[PDB]
Amino acid sequence: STEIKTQVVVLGAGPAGYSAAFRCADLGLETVIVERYNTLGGVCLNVGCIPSKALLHVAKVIEEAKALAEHGIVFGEPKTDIDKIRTWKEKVINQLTGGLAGMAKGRKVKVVNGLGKFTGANTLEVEGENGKTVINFDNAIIAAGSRPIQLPFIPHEDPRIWDSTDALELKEVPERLLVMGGGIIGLEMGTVYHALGSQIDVVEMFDQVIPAADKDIVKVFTKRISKKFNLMLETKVTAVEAKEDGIYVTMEGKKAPAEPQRYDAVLVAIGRVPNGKNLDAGKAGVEVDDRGFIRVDKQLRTNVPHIFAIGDIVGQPMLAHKGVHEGHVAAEVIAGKKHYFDPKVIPSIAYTEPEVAWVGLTEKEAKEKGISYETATFPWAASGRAIASDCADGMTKLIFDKESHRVIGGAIVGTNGGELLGEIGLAIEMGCDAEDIALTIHAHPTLHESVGLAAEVFEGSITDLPNPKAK
Amino acid sequence: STEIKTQVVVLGAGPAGYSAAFRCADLGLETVIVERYNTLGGVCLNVGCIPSKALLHVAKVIEEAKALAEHGIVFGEPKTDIDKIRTWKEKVINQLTGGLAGMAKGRKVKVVNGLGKFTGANTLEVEGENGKTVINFDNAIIAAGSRPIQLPFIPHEDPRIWDSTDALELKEVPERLLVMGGGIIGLEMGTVYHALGSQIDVVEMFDQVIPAADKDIVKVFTKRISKKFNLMLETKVTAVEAKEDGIYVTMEGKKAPAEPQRYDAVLVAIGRVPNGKNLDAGKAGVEVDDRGFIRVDKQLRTNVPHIFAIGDIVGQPMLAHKGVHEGHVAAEVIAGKKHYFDPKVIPSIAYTEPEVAWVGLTEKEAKEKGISYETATFPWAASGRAIASDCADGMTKLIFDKESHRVIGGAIVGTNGGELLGEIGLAIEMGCDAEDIALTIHAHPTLHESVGLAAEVFEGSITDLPNPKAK
Ligand SMILES: Cc1cc2nc3c(=O)[nH]c(=O)nc-3n(C[C@H](O)[C@H](O)[C@H](O)COP(=O)(O)OP(=O)(O)OC[C@H]3O[C@@H](n4cnc5c(N)ncnc54)[C@H](O)[C@@H]3O)c2cc1C
Numbered sequence: 029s030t031e032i033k034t035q036v037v038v039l040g041a042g043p044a045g046y047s048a049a050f051r052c053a054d055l056g057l058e059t060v061i062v063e064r065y066n067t068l069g070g071v072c073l074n075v076g077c078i079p080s081k082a083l084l085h086v087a088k089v090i091e092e093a094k095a096l097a098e099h100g101i102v103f104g105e106p107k108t109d110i111d112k113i114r115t116w117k118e119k120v121i122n123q124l125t126g127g128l129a130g131m132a133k134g135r136k137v138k139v140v141n142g143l144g145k146f147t148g149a150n151t152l153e154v155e156g157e158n159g160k161t162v163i164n165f166d167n168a169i170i171a172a173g174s175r176p177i178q179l180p181f182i183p184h185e186d187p188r189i190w191d192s193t194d195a196l197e198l199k200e201v202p203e204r205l206l207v208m209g210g211g212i213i214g215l216e217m218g219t220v221y222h223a224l225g226s227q228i229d230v231v232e233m234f235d236q237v238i239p240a241a242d243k244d245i246v247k248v249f250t251k252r253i254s255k256k257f258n259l260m261l262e263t264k265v266t267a268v269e270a271k272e273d274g275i276y277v278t279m280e281g282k283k284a285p286a287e288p289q290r291y292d293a294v295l296v297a298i299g300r301v302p303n304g305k306n307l308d309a310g311k312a313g314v315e316v317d318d319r320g321f322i323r324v325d326k327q328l329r330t331n332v333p334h335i336f337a338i339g340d341i342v343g344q345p346m347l348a349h350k351g352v353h354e355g356h357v358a359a360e361v362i363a364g365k366k367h368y369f370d371p372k373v374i375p376s377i378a379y380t381e382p383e384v385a386w387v388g389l390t391e392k393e394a395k396e397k398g399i400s401y402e403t404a405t406f407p408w409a410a411s412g413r414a415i416a417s418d419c420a421d422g423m424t425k426l427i428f429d430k431e432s433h434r435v436i437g438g439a440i441v442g443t444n445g446g447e448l449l450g451e452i453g454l455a456i457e458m459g460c461d462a463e464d465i466a467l468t469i470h471a472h473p474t475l476h477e478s479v480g481l482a483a484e485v486f487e488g489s490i491t492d493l494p495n496p497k498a499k
Numbered sequence: 500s501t502e503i504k505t506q507v508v509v510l511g512a513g514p515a516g517y518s519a520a521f522r523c524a525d526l527g528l529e530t531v532i533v534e535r536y537n538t539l540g541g542v543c544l545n546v547g548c549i550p551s552k553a554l555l556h557v558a559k560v561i562e563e564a565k566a567l568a569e570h571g572i573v574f575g576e577p578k579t580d581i582d583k584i585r586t587w588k589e590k591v592i593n594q595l596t597g598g599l600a601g602m603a604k605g606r607k608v609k610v611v612n613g614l615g616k617f618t619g620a621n622t623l624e625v626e627g628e629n630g631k632t633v634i635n636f637d638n639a640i641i642a643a644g645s646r647p648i649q650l651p652f653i654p655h656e657d658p659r660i661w662d663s664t665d666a667l668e669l670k671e672v673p674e675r676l677l678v679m680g681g682g683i684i685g686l687e688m689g690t691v692y693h694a695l696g697s698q699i700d701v702v703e704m705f706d707q708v709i710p711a712a713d714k715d716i717v718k719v720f721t722k723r724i725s726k727k728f729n730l731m732l733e734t735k736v737t738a739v740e741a742k743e744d745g746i747y748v749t750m751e752g753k754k755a756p757a758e759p760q761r762y763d764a765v766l767v768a769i770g771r772v773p774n775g776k777n778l779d780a781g782k783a784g785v786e787v788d789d790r791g792f793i794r795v796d797k798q799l800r801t802n803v804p805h806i807f808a809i810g811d812i813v814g815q816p817m818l819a820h821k822g823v824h825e826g827h828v829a830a831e832v833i834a835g836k837k838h839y840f841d842p843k844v845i846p847s848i849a850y851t852e853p854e855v856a857w858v859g860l861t862e863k864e865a866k867e868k869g870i871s872y873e874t875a876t877f878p879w880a881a882s883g884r885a886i887a888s889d890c891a892d893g894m895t896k897l898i899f900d901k902e903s904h905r906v907i908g909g910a911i912v913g914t915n916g917g918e919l920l921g922e923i924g925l926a927i928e929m930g931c932d933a934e935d936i937a938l939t940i941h942a943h944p945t946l947h948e949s950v951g952l953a954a955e956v957f958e959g960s961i962t963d964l965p966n967p968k969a970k
C-alpha cells in the first residue's frame with residue numbers, strides 16, 4: 029500500500045470534478061483527483077453528451093442528404109458500416125480524454141486510479157488495481173455523478189435491454205426498437221437509430237415528451253417527430269419478457285396495443301439517480317439524503333464545512349454546464365475567495381431534429397409561481413433563412429414580465445435551435461427588456477434574428493409579420 | 500394616364516423600402532410603394548441573400564454528405580438535376596414574394612408598377628407598363644438600392660461573363676470558373692459552384708479575401724478554402740477576351756500565370772454601387788454625391804427635410820439588416836416620433852463553409868482609431884461539439900477594451916459560425932464586460948459556448964484550455 033497528503037482531493041473526474049481540480053491547480057492549491065475508470069471526463073465525455081453529439085451529427089447529415097432528393101440532388105441510399113462509425117466515435121472521445129490527461133499533467137494535478145471511499149472526516153482511501161492508496165486532505169470535493177435508473181421487473185441482464193451507454197456502443201441496428209421515456213436522452217437515441225434504419229416506438233407516461241418544456245414549443249416538436257416515431261403518450265410498460273426472438277413488452281394506457289409487442293431491443297431511458305450513497309459519506313460526517321443527493325449551500329458546502337459537493341450528485345438539473353460552474357465556485361471558495369453559486373438561469377437543450385432549447389422561466393413555471401407574463405413568438409415559416417434552409421417549421425419564443433417588460437425566459441424549436449440560447453441567456457442575465465433586444469441589429473438572414481423579431485412582436489413594431497398590436 | 504395622392508410614397512421595395520412602408524402603414528400613415536419589377540423584396544429576396552442561402556444550403560449538405568464517406572456512411576456521387584435545383588430555388592422565392600404582396604394588401608399599402616422618377620419636390624412620376632402615374636406626396640422615402648459594378652474593358656455583353664444575378668440563375672455548371680473579387684458575394688458563389696463540380700479560381704487585388712475581417716480570423720478561413728479554390732491574391736485582371744472556346748483572362752501580379760487562362764465563365768464580383776443618380780433626385784432638390792450615394796443624417800433625412808433615403812442607396816455597409824432598421828426609424832420619424840438611427844454595432848457574415856462572422860470593432864479598426872484593446876480566442880480544436888461535428892478548425896474571438904474590460908468586438912470562423920453573432924452583438928450593445936459573459940452559463944456541448952469560453956480566457960479563469968494567466 030501507499031499513503032499521500034494534499035490540500036484538495038477531488039472525487040470523480042467528470043466535468044464538475046476536473047473543472048474544480050483544474051481551477052484549484054490554477055489557484056495555486058495542491059490537488060489530487062481520484063477517478064475509478066481508465067480515462068477522465070466522466071459520463072459526459074465517455075458515455076454521454078459527446079458521443080451523443082457525434083452520432084447525432086451523423087444522423088442529421090444522413091437525414092439532410094436524403095431530403096435533398098426532391099430538390100435535384102439524389103444521393104440514393106448510404107452504404108453504412110457501423111463498425112467504422114463506432115471507430116470514428118471512439119476517435120473523437122480518445123482525442124478529448126487525451127487532452128484531459130495532458131492538461132492534468134500541465135497543471136500538475138495527480139491522478140489516482142481507484143474506487144475511493146471516505147475513511148474519516150479528513151481521510152479518503154482509494155482501492156485501485158494499483159494498490160491501496162490512503163489520502164489525507166484539508167478539503168474534499170465530492171463529484172461522483174449519477175447513473176441510469178433501473179426498474180426491478182425489467183430483465184436488465186439481457187443484452188437487448190439497453191441503458192444509454194449500450195445505445196452509444198452502437199453494437200447493432202435493431203430492426204425494431206423501443207424507447208422507454210420521452211425525455212431528452214431517449215428522444216436523441218431514437219433520432220440516431222432511426223437515421224440508421226431502426227423502427228422507433230416511444231413510450232412515455234406523461235402526456236408530452238420533454239415534460240419540462242412548454243406546450244406550444246413541444247407541439248411543434250411533436251408534429252415533427254410523430255412522422256418519424258410511433259409516440260405512445262400517457263402509456264406505461266407493465267411487463268417485459270426476454271424471449272428468444274425478441275423482447276416482449278406489455279403496455280397499458282391511452283396508446284397501448286392490445287397484445288404484447290416484440291422488439292429487438294429496448295432502451296430504458298427513464299432517468300438518472302445520484303451516487304450519493306456509495307462513497308461512505310457517512311464515515312466523513314457528510315449527510316446523504318433519501319433520494320441519493322448530497323445537499324449543499326450557495327457555496328457548495330456539505331454539512332461538513334471543509335467537504336464540498338458539485339455536479340449531478342447535488343440535484344437537478346443534471347447538466348454538464350451546471351457542474352462545471354459549481355466546480356469553479358467550489359474551488360474559488362476553498363482558495364479563500366468569497367464567491368457564490370447562484371445563476372438566475374440554466375439552459376437546457378434537446379439535440380434532436382428539430383432542436384428544442386429553452387432557458388429561464390417557462391410558461392408553466394411562471395403560470396405556477398404566479399408571475400404575470402406575456403409571450404411573443406416568431407414563427408420560422410416567415411423566416412427567409414428557415415425557408416431557404418428547408419427547415420421552415422420552428423418558432424422562437426420570448427417570455428416577458430408584463431410590467432418590467434424584462435425578458436424572463438425564451439425557447440426555440442428548430443434546426444440548430446440550440447445555438448440561439450446564448451443570446452437569450454445573456455439578455456435574461458443582464459436584465460434586458462424587449463426594447464433592448466428589438467433595437468439590437470441582428471444579421472439577416474440568420475435564424476438567430478428571430479430572437480430580435482420576437483421582441484419586435486412584443487414591442488408591436490414588427491413589420492416582417494402582420495402587426496395586430498398597433499393601429 | 501392617372502394621378503394619385505398620399506402622405507407617403509416609398510421608392511423601391513427591397514428590405515429597406517417595404518420595411519419603411521409597412522412601418523408607415525402600421526403607424527396609421529397613407530402609403531404607396533413604387534417598384535419597377537414584377538415582385539416585391541428587391542435584390543435581397545429575388546437575386547440576393549435568399550437565393551444565395553438556398554444554393555449554399557444545398558452545397559453544404561453535398562459537402563457534408565461526401566465527408567461522411569470516411570466514417571462509414573458512403574453515399575457515392577449525387578445524381579444532380581440543376582433544372583430541379585433551380586425550380587426549388589424559384590419556389591422558395593415565390594413563396595416569400597407572395598407573402599410580401601399578401602402583407603402589402605393586409606396593410607392596405609398600394610403597390611404601383613413602374614420606373615419612378617422625381618418630377619418636383621413633392622411630385623414623383625412612375626412610367627410603368629400600366630400607364631403614366633403621377634404621385635403627389637407629403638413625404639418620400641428613397642430606397643432604390645444598388646447594382647453590381649461593371650468594368651469597361653470587360654465584355655459584359657457575353658453571356659459567359661456573369662454578375663451575381665447570372666450566377667444565381669444557375670444556367671449551367673461551368674467546368675472552369677473564374678471569380679473576380681475575394682469578397683463575400685464572390686466567395687459564396689465559388690462555394691456553390693464547387694459543390695456542383697466547377698473548378699474554382701479566385702483573383703483578388705488585396706492580399707487577403709474578405710479584406711475587412713481580421714487577419715487571424717481569415718487565416719483560418721483561407722487555410723480551409725485554399726484546399727478547394729485556387730486563390731490568386733495580390734493579383735489583377737488586365738485583359739478579358741471573348742473567344743469561341745472560352746473567356747481568356749490575362750492576369751498580372753504575385754500569382755499570375757504566364758499565359759492567359761481559358762475559363763468557361765467569369766463572375767465579376769467586384770462590388771456594388773448606389774442608384775442615386777437615376778431618380779432625377781435633382782428635380783426634387785435632393786442632392787446626390789459623386790459616388791452615387793444620397794447622404795443622410797441620424798434621422799435619414801436628405802437635405803430636403805421631407806424626403807428620406809434608406810438602405811444601400813445611402814452608404815456602407817450595403818446590408819439588408821441595416822436597410823430594414825433605417826426603414827423603421829425613417830417611418831417613425833415621419834409619423835412624428837422623435838427617433839434616431841445610430842447603432843453602435845452592425846454584424847457581417849460570409850455564409851461560406853466555414854462561415855466568417857464578425858461584429859463591432861475589428862483589430863484593424865481599433866489598431867487604427869488607436870483604441871487600446873486585448874483579445875481572447877477560443878480554438879474549436881478544444882471544442883467537444885466541434886470535434887464531434889467534424890468541424891474542429893474554427894475559433895471564436897472576443898475583443899475587449901483593456902481598462903473597461905468591455906467587449907468591443909467579436910468574430911467567428913467555423914461551421915454555423917454566423918449563428919453565434921446574436922449573443923456578441925447583444926453584449927456589445929448592453930456594454931457587457933468579460934465577467935458578465937464568462938459567468939453566464941452556456942449550454943454544453945454547443946458551439947456558442949465558445950463565446951463564454953473566450954471570455955474565460957480573458958478573465959484567466961478558463962479550465963477547458965491550458966490557462967497561462969493564473970499562477
Ligand atoms: C446519454 C447522455 C447524454 C447527455 N447529454 C447531455 C447534454 O447534451 N448536455 C449536458 O449538459 N449534459 C448531458 N448529459 C448529462 C451529463 O453527462 C452529466 O450532467 C454530467 O456528466 C455530470 O458530470 P459530473 O461531473 O457531475 O458527473 P459524471 O460525469 O458522472 O462524473 C463522475 C465521475 O466520478 C467517477 N466516480 C463515481 N464514483 C466514484 C468513486 N467512488 N471513486 C472514484 N471515482 C468515482 C465516475 O467514474 C465518473 O467519472 C448527458 C448524459 C447522458 C447519459
Ligand SMILES: Cc1cc2nc3c(=O)[nH]c(=O)nc-3n(C[C@H](O)[C@H](O)[C@H](O)COP(=O)(O)OP(=O)(O)OC[C@H]3O[C@@H](n4cnc5c(N)ncnc54)[C@H](O)[C@@H]3O)c2cc1C
Pocket residue numbers: 472473510511512513514515516533534535536540541542543544546547548551613614615616642643644645663664684774777778809810811812817818819820822
Ligand atoms: C448576391 C448577393 C448576396 C447578398 N447577401 C446578403 C446577405 O447575406 N446579407 C445581407 O444583409 N445582404 C446581402 N446582400 C445585400 C442585400 O441584398 C442588400 O443590402 C439589400 O437588398 C439592400 O436592400 P435595399 O432596399 O436597400 O435595396 P434593394 O434590395 O436593391 O431594393 C431596391 C428596389 O428598388 C427598385 N428600384 C430601383 N430604382 C427604381 C426606380 N427608379 N423605380 C422603381 N423602383 C426602383 C429595385 O427594383 C429594387 O427592387 C446580398 C446581395 C447580393 C447581390
